[PDB]
Amino acid sequence: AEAGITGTWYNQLGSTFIVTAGADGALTGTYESAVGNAESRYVLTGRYDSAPATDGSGTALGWTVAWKNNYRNAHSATTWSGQYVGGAEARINTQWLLTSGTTEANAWKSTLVGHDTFTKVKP
Amino acid sequence: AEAGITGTWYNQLGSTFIVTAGADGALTGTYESAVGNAESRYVLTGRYDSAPATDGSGTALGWTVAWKNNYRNAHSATTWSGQYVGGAEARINTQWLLTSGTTEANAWKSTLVGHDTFTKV
């Protein structure tokens, strides 16, 4: 449900995800690096299923962050694909892909894969 | 076809993969890296479906290569998961995971993912 996703979340490395779920299936917000002052905020845009199933199934969603802001440009973008599972302890379980811009010759190792779990802290 | 996996395969980067498929599901062979070289060879071991479905489906398989031999140790290992499809133009289509041994602090970025298509040409 949009409300449930909306809010502030943190993952196991200490990064901050602040998101607003809109009625039309859109996701907008900011992603912040693990601790590290204020200028470590990047823009994120995504989409979720605004009409999930009844059942105790999670809500699929995904979002992207290109790691460029006014202070730094890591020439890479990360996409997280996962499910929001509500309850008293809501969580967003994801798998992510981080791709860096490379030359033709290093393209073979341009992408990293991992997984993060987010815990909600504020609405 | 079944032991059609046996042979020498090449991927788009130039690596050569030589494997023997045992009747019971084993995959054994050598994986050689860049230039052809001499000890650019690493051991590989895997498993495949020795009784694949009798419908035009490919044969599921996978194998691993630890990047250490008596000349180099790149402290990493790669696993390829995919399927074999035979015919006039046999191919092995895979997706792989390359994990490097790291310290905790670097564990989050210890794994790369990619895809390779191997042919006998």
Binding site: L13, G36, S40, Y42, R72, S76, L98 | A105, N106, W108
Partner: peptide, 8 residues
């Protein structure tokens, strides 16, 4: 990388 933890 901004996606990983704080440095040493």
């Amino acid at each position: 990388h901004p996606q990983g933890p704080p440095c040493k």
